Design a protein around this ligand. Structure first.
Ligand code: 6VR
Ligand code: NAG
Length: 335
C-alpha cells in the first residue's frame, strides 16, 4: 500500500516525458507515458547509425547491462504518426522508485521523421495487454503484480507552463492521484470496453452541437500532443472555426485567436469545455502572423478507430485518473 510519482518535463506544450532507468547499472531514458499504447520501447545500440534519430537519442546498450535477458523476437509498433521497429528484450526498469522486471522493445529502426522531432527517447505504454504488440505484459500490469501500490490507478497532471523552468512540467502518480494538482470532485466515465482507454462521446460543440451527434469514440491519450479527430471530423470543426488547413497543422491569423469560440466535448453527461486559450498557441496577436491550433486530423484505424483522441491539450485542463480496478477514467480540473 504505497504511492509513487514520476516528475515530467514539458517541452513546448506538445511533448511530456519523464525519466526511467533500464538495466544494471541504470541507463536513463526520456520516455512518454502513453495511455494510447501498451508497449515499452527505447532506441537500441543495435540501431544503425544511418538512422539519425538513433544518433540523436539515448540508446539502450544491452552489453552494458548485467541484468539483461535476451529474447530477440521482432516487433513493429505502428503508431498513427509513424512506426518504430526492433526486437524484444528483458531488463529491470526503474520508474518512480519502483523496480520491475519488464519486457521492452529495443528499437533498431527509428525514422528521422518524425523521431528527430522527439525530445523523448522512447515510450512507456500505459494501455492494456489487449493493445500490446507481441502480447507483452505492460509495465503497469507488472507493477500491479508486485502488490506494492495503494490502488489499481494512475494519474496524469500536465502543466500549462513550459517556459518557466523553475516549475513542474508534469507529474504521474502511480497508485493514486495528487490533490495538490486537482480541485473539485472527480467525474468518472466508464470505458466502452476493457483493453483500451476509450470512452463514449455524445457531442462535439463549437460555441451548438455540430459534430458527434449520433455518438462517437474518445480515446484518452496522454501520449498525444493534441485533441484529434477523423479527417472529416476535423475538416468540419475547422470550417466552423475559420481555420486554414496546412501540411501538418491548422492555423488562424493570430489576431483571430482570442475571438475563437469555445469547443465542448460531451463526455459522461457533462460538457467538457475548452476556451480558445486552451487550444490556440497564441505566439502573437499580429494579423500578419499565423497561430497554430492544438487540434489536428489523426485517422486511427480499426478496431480502436475511427476515434477522437484527447491528448495533452485536454489533459492540461483536466487532471486525469486512470482506474484499472473499475475500468473507468476520472476527470477533475487541474491546478
Ligand atoms: C511515439 C508516440 C508518443 C506517438 N504518439 C504521438 O502522439 C506523438 C507522435 N509524434 C511525436 C513527435 C515525434 C512528432 C514529437 N510526438 C507525439 N507525442 C508527444 C507527446 C508526449 C506527451 C504528449 O504528447 C501517439 C500515437 C498513438 C498512441 N499515443 C501516442
Ligand atoms: C521470448 O519470450 C517469450 C515469452 O512469451 C518466450 O515464450 C520465448 O521463448 C522467448 N524467446 C527467446 C528466444 O528467449
Amino acid at each position: 500500500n504505497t504511492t509513487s510519482s514520476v516528475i515530467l518535463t514539458n517541452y513546448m506544450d506538445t511533448q511530456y516525458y519523464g525519466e526511467i532507468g533500464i538495466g544494471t547499472p541504470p541507463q536513463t531514458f526520456k520516455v512518454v507515458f502513453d495511455t494510447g499504447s501498451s508497449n515499452v520501447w527505447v532506441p537500441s545500440s543495435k540501431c544503425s547509425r544511418l538512422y539519425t534519430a538513433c544518433v540523436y537519442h539515448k540508446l539502450f546498450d544491452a552489453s552494458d547491462s548485467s541484468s539483461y535477458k535476451h529474447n530477440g523476437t521482432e516487433l513493429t509498433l505502428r503508431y498513427s504518426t509513424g512506426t518504430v521497429s526492433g526486437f524484444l528484450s528483458q531488463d529491470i526498469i526503474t520508474v518512480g522508485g519502483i523496480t520491475v522486471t519488464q519486457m521492452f522493445g529495443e528499437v533498431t529502426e527509428m525514422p528521422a521523421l518524425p523521431f528527430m522531432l522527439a525530445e523523448f527517447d522512447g515510450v512507456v505504454g500505459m494501455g492494456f495487454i489487449e493493445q500490446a504488440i507481441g502480447r507483452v505484459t505492460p509495465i503497469f500490469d507488472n507493477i500491479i503484480s508486485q502488490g506494492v501500490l495503494k490502488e489499481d490507478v494512475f494519474s496524469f497532471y500536465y502543466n500549462r507552463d513550459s517556459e518557466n523552468s523553475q516549475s513542474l512540467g508534469g507529474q504521474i502518480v502511480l497508485g493514486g492521484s495528487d490533490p495538490q494538482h486537482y480541485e473539485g470532485n472527480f467525474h468518472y466515465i466508464n470505458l466502452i470496453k476493457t483493453g483500451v482507454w476509450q470512452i463514449q462521446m455524445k457531442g462535439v460543440s463549437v460555441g451548438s452541437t455540430l459534430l458527434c451527434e449520433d455518438g462517437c469514440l474518445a480515446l484518452v491519450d496522454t501520449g498525444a500532443s493534441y485533441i484529434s479527430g477523423s479527417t472529416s471530423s476535423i475538416e468540419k470543426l475547422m470550417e466552423a472555426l475559420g481555420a486554414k488547413k496546412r501540411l501538418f497543422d491548422y492555423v488562424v491569423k493570430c489576431n483571430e485567436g482570442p475571438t475563437l469560440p469555445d469547443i465542448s466535448f460531451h463526455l459522461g453527461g457533462k460538457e467538457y469545455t475548452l476556451t480558445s486559450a486552451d487550444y490556440v498557441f497564441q505566439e502573437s496577436y499580429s494579423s500578419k502572423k499565423l497561430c497554430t491550433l492544438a487540434i489536428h486530423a489523426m485517422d486511427i484505424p480499426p478496431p480502436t478507430g475511427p476515434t477522437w483522441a484527447l491528448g495533452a491539450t485536454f489533459i492540461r485542463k483536466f487532471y486525469t485518473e486512470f482506474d484499472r480496478r473499475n475500468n473507468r477514467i476520472g476527470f477533475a480540473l487541474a491546478r
